[PDB]
Design a protein around this ligand. Structure first.
Ligand SMILES: OC[C@H]1O[C@@H](Oc2cccc3cccnc23)[C@H](O)[C@@H](O)[C@H]1O
Length: 157
């Protein structure tokens, strides 16, 4: 099982930065939508539904310390969960070698945010843990973390 970010080199485990554009201005009452399907794709390394991969997101995935007061939702594979995640998500099954963009969106509601710059460019905004286990043998389980990083400032007036 492998993934990539923005069409880059293959990743089999570990932590990877995922850079995203955010609305540069956020009004109170509004949320930020982060569509991670635009960045992260994964695939089965054999294809043909031979040793199918089973992927889910993991309890504990959260905003990153500075933004832990924030509220959110996490859409994954037909279900929208409260974020930070308090349980493991449903399983997505990956059997084709053709990359599948992850069906993954984060909705962010800044809470307790003070005026001016609320998110910095280069700031890790959320850490999403993803778990993989396949079908044959032990399943060769692997952990991924997606460190979601803003490409730009976000300001609130
Ligand atoms: O995705 C289908 C399977 O891929 C297996 O890994 C690979 C198989 C074949 C070629 C690969 C090339 C690079 C990385 N891995 C590869 C995993 O060992 C198994 O656990 C399951 O994930």
């Amino acid at each position: 099982f492998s993934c990539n970010v923005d069409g880059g080199s293959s990743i089999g485990a570990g932590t990877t930065s995922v850079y995203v554009n955010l609305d540069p201005v956020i009004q109170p009452g509004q949320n930020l939508v982060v569509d991670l399907s635009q960045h992260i794709s994964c695939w089965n390394d054999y294809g043909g539904w031979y040793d199918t991969d089973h992927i889910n997101l993991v309890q504990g995935s959260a905003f990153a310390g500075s933004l832990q007061s924030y509220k959110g939702s996490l859409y994954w594979n037909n279900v929208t969960y409260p974020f930070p995640l308090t349980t493991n998500t449903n399983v997505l099954d990956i059997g084709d070698k053709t990359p599948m963009p992850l069906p993954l969106k984060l909705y962010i509601t800044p809470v307790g945010a003070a005026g001016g710059v609320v998110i910095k460019a280069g700031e890790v905004i959320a850490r999403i843990h993803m778990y993989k286990i396949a079908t044959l043998g032990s399943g060769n389980p692997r952990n991924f973390t997606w460190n979601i990083i803003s490409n730009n400032s976000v300001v609130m007036p």
